[PDB]
Structures are given as structure tokens and as C-alpha cells.
Amino acid sequence: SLYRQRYQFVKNLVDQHEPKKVADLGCGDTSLLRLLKVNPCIELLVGVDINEDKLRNLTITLYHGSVVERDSRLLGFDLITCIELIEHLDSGDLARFPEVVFGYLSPSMIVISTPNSEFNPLFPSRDSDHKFEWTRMEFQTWALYVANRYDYSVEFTGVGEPPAGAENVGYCTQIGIFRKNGGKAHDQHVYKAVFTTSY
Numbered sequence: 001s002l003y004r005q006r007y008q009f010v011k012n013l014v015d016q017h018e019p020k021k022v023a024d025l026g027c028g029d030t031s032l033l034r035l036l037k038v039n040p041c042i043e044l045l046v047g048v049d050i051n052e053d054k055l056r057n058l059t060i061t062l063y064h065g066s067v068v069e070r071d072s073r074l075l076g077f078d079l080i081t082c083i084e085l086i087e088h089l090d091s092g093d094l095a096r097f098p099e100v101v102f103g104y105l106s107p108s109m110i111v112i113s114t115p116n117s118e119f120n121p122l123f124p125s126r127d128s129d130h131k132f133e134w135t136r137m138e139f140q141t142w143a144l145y146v147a148n149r150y151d152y153s154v155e156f157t158g159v160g161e162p163p164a165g166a167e168n169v170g171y172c173t174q175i176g177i178f179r180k181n182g183g184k185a186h187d188q189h190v191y192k193a194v195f196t197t198s199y
């Protein structure tokens, strides 16, 4: 339902900008990668996840690894996505996350999605699934800070519109699209490749 919408958001973005090198950080069961490989613009498609069990002309590679460690094999990418990841990082990792993804990796575009804790109406269905949840203001102040620090511009959108009678208090999933200002523009191998294929 909503995960479908998130994936389709990313697919639409890929169709629009045709990135050649795409990485999904916190890729989970690799569903998003499976969807994106459809598009022939992509020449390199990479997934990274700390959960090894979930991972068990075109090159596709899956790495067991953490978003807060610098691996040089993820340098020079066109698009990096972090879909529903940041709300599972503890304060330390959250603090390190931008210096690695924006500072070190420095891709042309980054997409970050996270729940809008203010979403109206809250659908009854747990909060204990993740570490934290952010309001729109919390996400946007964080995202603007990161944007200004690393010389990206950030566009806010999301997926999952309020149902027709509800007061609009944002999308269910809030999304920041970060674009490197000006556009494009030693080996540190840390990740362990779990799977790779090329053809």
C-alpha cells in the first residue's frame, strides 16, 4: 500500500532523471532494487544493509554493511536512496549519517523518506517498531541544516495523502529530495559483498 507508493515515487524519479549509478541504503529485502532494475538507464545498482539475513552493461551488487561507515565503492553515484531508514538509527549513528552520505559519498541526488508523525488522521492498526519519529518541522529543520552544510538544495514532498475529510497535516511519508548544487561534478573497502552479478 504505502510501501508501494514509496517505491513508485522512487521509480518515477529514476525515470525522470535517468541516473546511471543508483544505491539503496537500508535496502532490506531488495524490493526497490528489483523494481528499479527495470529501467535501462541504470548501469550500476547497489543495495546496502546491516541485516545480512535480509540480503541472502548492468551490474547489481548487495553489500552487508552500515550506512555510517565509509566505503569507497559507493563514491561517484548519481542517486542514493534512504527509504524509511533514518528513524531506525540511534542518536550516534543519526549524527554520523550525514557526514558519510552527504559529506563522503557526495552523490548527485539523495532521497530520504521518513514517517510524518503529525499525519492526520493517525491510522489505528506499533510505535515501538522504530527509535524515533519526527514531525514535519523536525524533519525539515534537520534536512535544511544538512542541505546548507553540504551544499545541496532540498525539495520537500511525500506520499500518502490525507483522506478526503481530514484536515491536511502533511503526507503520511515525508520525503526530502536533495540535489547537489551545481550538479555533477584512496580505497576504503569496508562492506562485505554478499551478492553480485554483471551482464
Ligand SMILES: C[S@@+](CC[C@H](N)C(=O)[O-])C[C@H]1O[C@@H](n2cnc3c(N)ncnc32)[C@H](O)[C@@H]1O
Binding pocket: 003, 025, 026, 027, 028, 029, 031, 048, 049, 050, 051, 054, 065, 066, 067, 068, 082, 083, 084, 085, 088, 089, 093
Ligand atoms: C524500515 S526498513 C526499510 C527497508 C526498505 N528501505 C524499504 O523501504 O522497504 C529499515 C532497513 O534499514 C536497515 N538498517 C538499519 N540500520 C542500518 C544501518 N546502520 N546501515 C544499513 N542498513 C540499516 C534495516 O536492516 C532495515 O532493512
